[PDB]
Design a binder for these strands. Structure first.
Length: 106
DNA sequence: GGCGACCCGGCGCCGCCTACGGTCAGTACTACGGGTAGGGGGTATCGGGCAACGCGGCACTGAACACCGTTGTCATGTGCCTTG
């Protein structure tokens, strides 16, 4: 949590370096975008021991959330081809990404 | 003011080996952009199958000489007959 706070501070100094009053709004609408950017980058870059690249990271999170949506809607484990279709990828890429998203066990 | 309690911290330990043990966890997104390790073809260099060309024993063209062996040969010596 506290490292996330520091990374948000980093995004804040970045955003205020790139803010001007020309925008006809408050700070809270401009800075928050860059804070979100910095936190997302940190969570994608230094979260996993076996580091994944950013593109694969968003692949993992998209797969996880859409799979959770499938479970919520259908209430059953969807067929691999079904998940492949909602993702539009192939089943081979599906098993690949599923294996790439594990965590080390101590 | 140093003692004194007490108070707390603070640690530190709590005995030796042996069989097997069962599993799973929630809230971004796109977009570009470079740059690649992988997909291709074509080329230069090194790495295989048949003959290569030696050698050597001996062996023959036997040729040309050598080594005994031999009956060629013979001008020159004994024995009998005729005459001094």
């Amino acid at each position: 949590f506290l490292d996330l706070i520091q990374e948000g501070n980093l995004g804040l100094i970045r955003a205020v370096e790139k803010f001007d009053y020309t925008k006809g709004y408050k700070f809270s609408t401009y800075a928050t975008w860059w804070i979100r950017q910095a936190i997302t980058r940190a969570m994608a870059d230094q979260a996993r021991t076996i580091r994944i690249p950013v593109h694969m990271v968003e692949v993992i999170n998209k797969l996880a959330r859409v799979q959770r949506q499938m479970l919520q809607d259908l209430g059953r484990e969807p067929t691999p081809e079904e998940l492949a279709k909602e993702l539009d990828m192939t089943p081979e890429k599906v098993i690949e990404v599923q294996k790439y998203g594990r965590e080390p066990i101590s």
